[PDB]
Amino acid sequence: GRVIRNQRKGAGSIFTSHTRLRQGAAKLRTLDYAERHGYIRGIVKQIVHDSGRGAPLAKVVFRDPYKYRLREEIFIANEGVHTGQFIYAGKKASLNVGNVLPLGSVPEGTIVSNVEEKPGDRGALARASGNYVIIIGHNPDENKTRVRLPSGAKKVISSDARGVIGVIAGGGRVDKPLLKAGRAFHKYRLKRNSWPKTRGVAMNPVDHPHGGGNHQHIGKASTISRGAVSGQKAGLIAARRTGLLRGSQKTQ
Amino acid sequence: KALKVRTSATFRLPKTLKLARAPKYASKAVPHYNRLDSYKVIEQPITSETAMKKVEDGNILVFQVSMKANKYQIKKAVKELYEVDVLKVNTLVRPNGTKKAYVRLTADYDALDIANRIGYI
Amino acid sequence: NPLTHSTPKNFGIGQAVQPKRNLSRYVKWPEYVRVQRQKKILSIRLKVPPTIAQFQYTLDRNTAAETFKLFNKYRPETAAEKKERLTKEAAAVAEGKSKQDASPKPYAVKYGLNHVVALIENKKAKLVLIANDVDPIELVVFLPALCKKMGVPYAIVKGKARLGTLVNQKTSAVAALTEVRAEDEAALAKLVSTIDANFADKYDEVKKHWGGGILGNKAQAKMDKRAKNSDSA
Amino acid sequence: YATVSKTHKTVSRAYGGSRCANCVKERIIRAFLIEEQKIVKKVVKEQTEAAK
RNA sequence: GAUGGGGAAGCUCCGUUUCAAAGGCCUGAUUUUAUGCAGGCCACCAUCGAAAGGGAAUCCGGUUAAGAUUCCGGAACCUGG
RNA sequence: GCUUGUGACGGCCCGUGAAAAUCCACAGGAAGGAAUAGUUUUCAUGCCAGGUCGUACUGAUAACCGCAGCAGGUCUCCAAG
RNA sequence: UUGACAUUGUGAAGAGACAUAGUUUCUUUACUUAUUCAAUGAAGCGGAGCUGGAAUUCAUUUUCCACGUUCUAGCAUUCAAGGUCCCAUUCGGGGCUGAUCCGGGUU
Ligand SMILES: [Mg+2]
Ligand SMILES: [Mg+2]
Ligand SMILES: [Mg+2]
Ligand SMILES: [Mg+2]
Ligand SMILES: [Mg+2]
Ligand SMILES: [Mg+2]
Ligand SMILES: [Mg+2]
Ligand SMILES: [Mg+2]
Ligand SMILES: [Mg+2]
Ligand SMILES: [Mg+2]
Ligand SMILES: [Mg+2]
Ligand SMILES: [Mg+2]
Ligand SMILES: [Mg+2]
Ligand SMILES: [Mg+2]
Ligand SMILES: [Mg+2]
Ligand SMILES: [Mg+2]
Ligand SMILES: [Mg+2]
Ligand SMILES: [Mg+2]
Ligand SMILES: [Mg+2]
Ligand SMILES: [Mg+2]
Ligand SMILES: [Mg+2]
Ligand SMILES: [Mg+2]
Ligand SMILES: [Mg+2]
Ligand SMILES: [Mg+2]
Ligand SMILES: [Mg+2]
Ligand SMILES: [Mg+2]
Ligand SMILES: [Mg+2]
Ligand SMILES: [Mg+2]
Ligand SMILES: [Mg+2]
Ligand SMILES: [Mg+2]
Ligand SMILES: [Mg+2]
Ligand SMILES: [Mg+2]
Ligand SMILES: [Mg+2]
Ligand SMILES: [Mg+2]
Ligand SMILES: [Mg+2]
Ligand SMILES: [Mg+2]
């Protein structure tokens, strides 16, 4: 039969992301000489809304150590950071909300945002509004540092990998009901064409594993193996258990 | 001894000598004569009766003119082929793909006077 | 002193645009430059096998300088000099009736690879010089092995170009003497002796020694320092 | 603006056509005070350097 | 959508500033003489894509069978030199 | 009053509502410039030039698309009592 | 998706046979030049040294860290001022130093 919806997305045609309005990628500074020996000062010149992003960005200008010129970077704004505020970035810099320090240089239980997976990658972990990571240990002979990411997973990465002190702002966003279809409508309007969603069980067979039959029903287990093949993976993919979750979740 | 001293880490293409063309033979054997002399610019008078009026009333000569010619080339060509001085030159493409030049002479010339010393009427 | 003033700039992170410095160590060289450097590195990180490793041991600046000194007295004819000789003999041979021997026996250096090889096989060289470049090394790698067998004293010498000079070609790859004027037999036997001592004699032992396996120095330091302290507490 | 005399594109004072007066009061006060504290800061840690 | 490139038997596919030696400006040096060099910057990498988006500057009167913010008249304004 | 324009405000947003050409300004102070005479064309006045293509008319119960002078379809501005 | 072979090289300990000399095979953990991934207008890498100074000296230094920027929504550019050496002192202009050495491995 046909090619199912979830296969059509990969060609990206009507499914690429609606982007005209976005401020620009958000990154930490390039890990230059200043930032890995000393520290370098900047001013947040503005904190600003990004289209289809939860948390506001923070525009921070720095002096170019090598040319006479201002070089402005785009951060995700940690809560509490503000216009005018002075931001410090470097190994030898000071442990305050807003600054950017290498996970090696902050004590355990420090709380940081927008952290790198490898040093230099200008920030990958914990960027969504409200999220952060916690340093939960160090191993100095190897300079790994151990973090717990928003998911619960605990990675270990270079103590050189940089992070920014605090949590990312606009948290709480998801506690309030969308209420009507219009509000989701405009929500995905500035993200990507993923809304609304036809249930495959409302489709015909050509369309989808779940399509067809004289009452709507999946007809077979909707738990699909990892070893499945495109055109087949719809449902609960690789599901290692299923059903209503009872009792405290929380990874140990 | 020892090394250069580049203060830039960008390496660029060395600005190197550019020789000019000194052919072993002539490009095309004989250059083309002028492809748009005045006898090719201005092709005929236009002697439509509503044209003949601009002449009588407006001190203006209407010519069918080369499609390849511009206001410059039209103005010079009139000036040369007729003694006449030109004030300005309006032009337009007729609907049979040919160009019409409305040529205003300066106040010193009587275009009507010209018109019959060129022939038409 | 006067209305002039000391104002030292402070170039110390987060202040004063850094000054112009020499970034030569940093520049983003062209691929072709990057590549010929890295080829030289690669050939030295690897363990190079003995029959190539026998090159790199190149004749020393001294002994060599005096080997070109003898050899440069044996250049081949020039165009003028061969024009010159012909008339001198087109003249005499045709009328004075010289047996095509209105010309003195030429003594010059012997060159051209395939030429030099057959000379050696046929036991006529007395001193082969092999050049230490030559990029398809194969053209030449067997030349030591070959000269050892023909009991022909040889020397790997720096300058594939400089062997070209002594024979009026841009490069030359090999250069050999076979004949020599009595007034030079001596000079040669001296050279042949020194040279035989830095190569032909050392041959079998050179043959057992691989080369390369040589760290870059960011890695060497990582090893002198690591293997200083780890043992010496 | 390129068809208009320069007086239409400035007020006199430093940073005339470009910053808002009240804001230059600020640049000036702060410049002064911060250049001055820079003196206060040296001689304080200049003295430190021989009393430790 | 060309380009150094990378795929592909190939028609061609991918990439667009991309693991590329990617260029041109202000004048000085010229007073054999016309433009070679002498500083220095700038490293931005094509181009096409809007007759509703951005955008230098014109109006009133009069005039034709049929043109008019376009012609005639008067009165302006922009751009380059 | 009506249409339209515009201003200072106020409501809404898990929506906060393009780009680039182009223009000007300021920080800077390389450099240039006077009394036996310099500096000034961002003040006034003055001189020269401004190419190429489109420009009629219909825009609809007959000028477009529906085999057609088809009761269909086809984007918009002005709007009296 | 899983195995094998090829790309595939260098140490080291450990298991495996001629049947308790080391050619060879694998397990392991080292290496970095192949291959791979990021980064930047390939800018400050590795090594040594000046100085500071904790240290306690078991002869004298064995070391280990340091080794220009944090009240402020300013300012930081003309190979840098200073100092020092040149040209034949013009007006301009150049070296060094300021800014320590060494290796050219961009990280
Ligand atoms: Mg199908
Ligand atoms: Mg996209
Ligand atoms: Mg949709
Ligand atoms: Mg649904
Ligand atoms: Mg659903
Ligand atoms: Mg149905
Ligand atoms: Mg099916
Ligand atoms: Mg099924
Ligand atoms: Mg079904
Ligand atoms: Mg159901
Ligand atoms: Mg008249
Ligand atoms: Mg026209
Ligand atoms: Mg001779
Ligand atoms: Mg004013
Ligand atoms: Mg001023
Ligand atoms: Mg293409
Ligand atoms: Mg265009
Ligand atoms: Mg347009
Ligand atoms: Mg437009
Ligand atoms: Mg009218
Ligand atoms: Mg008319
Ligand atoms: Mg009309
Ligand atoms: Mg007019
Ligand atoms: Mg007038
Ligand atoms: Mg003008
Ligand atoms: Mg309206
Ligand atoms: Mg708003
Ligand atoms: Mg302005
Ligand atoms: Mg100068
Ligand atoms: Mg003017
Ligand atoms: Mg019309
Ligand atoms: Mg009609
Ligand atoms: Mg038809
Ligand atoms: Mg109809
Ligand atoms: Mg395996
Ligand atoms: Mg780099």
User: What does the block give as tokens for A209?
Assistant: 């594993």
Q: How far apart (Å, rounded) are the C-alpha atoms in residues C69 and B4?
A: 34
- Return the SS3 of C180: coil
Cβ contacts of C18 on chain A, cutoff 8 Å = 65-66
Among the bound ligands, the one closest to the CA of A234: 8
Distance B110 CA to E68 C1' (A): 25
C24 vs C10: CA distance, rounded Å: 24
Does strand G come within 7 Å of the CB of A164? no
Are the CB atoms for A150 and A132 separated by under 8 Å?
Answer: yes
Q: Name the token pair of D36.
A: 């001055």
**Closest amino acid to nucleotide E4 (CA–C1'):** C31
Residue of A nearest to C14 (CA): A40
C-alpha distances (whole Å) from B63 to each of A100, B91, B104, C18, C168 are 79, 10, 11, 72, 78
- Measure B36 CA to E63 C1' (Å): 36
Query: A100-102 and A162-165: which strand pairing?
Result: antiparallel
Cα A80-A86-A92 angle, rounded to 5 deg: 105
Q: Where are the alpha helices (DSSP H) in chain A?
A: 5-8, 33-37, 181-189
- Encoded tokens for A215: 């009452």
DSSP A74: E
Say if residues C177 and C110 touch (Cβ distance below 8 Å): yes
Structure tokens at C149: 């067998």
Q: C138-149 vs C113-121: helix axis angle to the nearest 10?
A: 20
| CB A135 within 8 Å of CB A108 | yes
Single out the residue of A202, A230, A188 nearest to residue A17, CA to CA: A188
Residue C99: phi and psi, rounded to 5, are: -75, 45
Q: % helix / strand / coil in chain C, to the nearest 5?
A: 45, 10, 45
Helices and strands of chain A, counted as H and E runs: 3, 12
Phi-psi region of A243 (alpha: psi -120 to 50; beta: other; left: phi over 0): left
Quick one: how many helices (H) and strands (E) in chain D? 1, 0
State the number of CA atoms in the 13 A half-sphere of B87 facing the CB: 14
Do residues A116 and A162 lie in contact, with contact meaning Cβ atoms separated by under 8 Å? yes
Residue D50 is classified by DSSP as T
Distances (CA, A) of A179 to A172, A175, A185, A187, C123: 16, 12, 11, 12, 102
**CA C30 / ligand 2 centre spacing (Å):** 33
A-chain residues near C13 (CB < 8 A): 33-34, 37-40, 65, 90
The half-sphere exposure of A7 on its side-chain side, counting CA atoms within 13 A, is 12
Chain F bases closer than 7 A to any CB of the protein: 13-18, 23-28, 42-44, 50-55
Burial class (CB in 10 A: 0-12, 13-18, 19+), B99: buried
Q: Report which bound ligand comes closest to the CA of B114.
A: 11
Residues with CB under 5 A from ligand 14 (ion): D 11
Cα(A164)–Cα(A116) distance, rounded to whole angstroms? 10
Residues 23-82/B with CB < 7 A to strand E:
49-50, 58
Q: How far apart are CA A97 and CA A80, in angstroms?
A: 8
Experimental structure resolution, Å = 3.0
Cα(A200)–Cα(A233) distance, rounded to whole angstroms? 12
Other residues' Cβ atoms within 10 Å of the Cβ of residue C34 = 11
Q: How many Cβ atoms are within 10 Å of A120's Cβ, its own excluded?
A: 15
Burial of A4 (0-12, 13-18, 19+ CB in 10 A): buried
Q: Give the distance, in angstroms, between residue A167 CA and nucleotide F9 C1'.
A: 36
Yes or no: say if C147 and C193 are a contact pair by the CB < 8 Å rule: no
Please check whether residue C18 touches A, CB under 8 A: yes
In Å, how far are C221, D28, D51 from A224, measured between CA atoms?
54, 70, 75
Structure tokens at C118: 């057959």
Method used experimentally:
X-ray
CA distance A234 to A198: 13
